[PDB]
Every structure is written in C-alpha cells, then in structure tokens.
Amino acid sequence: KPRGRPKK
DNA sequence: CGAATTAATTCG
DNA sequence: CGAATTAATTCG
C-alpha cells in the first residue's frame, strides 16, 4: 500500500 | 522496533 | 464539524 493509514 | 506518515475516531 | 487523540501502515 501507500504510506500512512489506509483510507476506508 | 522506531519514527514518519496519513487517515480514522473521539469528543467538545 | 473541528482540533486533539488514536490507530494503522511503510520504511530504515
């Protein structure tokens, strides 16, 4: 995935 | 594993 | 609905 918390 | 990053959740 | 807090994820 990309950096940081995944978008929901 | 930690900081960094990024978004979700909480709570006024 | 926003700022503060919390959480999930990558990279070194």
Author numbering: 34 to 41
Give sentences from the paper.
In our studies we have used a peptide with nine amino acids identical to those found in DBD3 and similar to those found in DBD2. As shown in the Methods section our crystals contain four complexes which are very similar. The geometry of the duplex and the central sequence of the AT-hook (PRGRP) are practically identical in the four complexes. On the other hand the external AT-hook terminal amino acids vary in each of the four complexes present in our crystal. The DNA duplex has a clear bend, localized in the region of base pairs 5 and 6. It determines an angle of 24° between the lower five bases and the upper seven bases of the duplex. The minor groove in one of them is occupied by the AT-hook, whereas the other region shows a clear spine of hydration, typical for the AATT sequence. The minor groove is wide in the region occupied by the AT-hook, with phosphate-phosphate distances in the range 12–13 Å. A clear hydrogen bond of the main chain NH group of Arg-38 is formed with one thymine oxygen. However the main lesson of our work is that the AT-hook can bind to a strongly distorted DNA molecule, whereas most models of interaction assume that the B form of DNA remains practically unchanged upon binding.
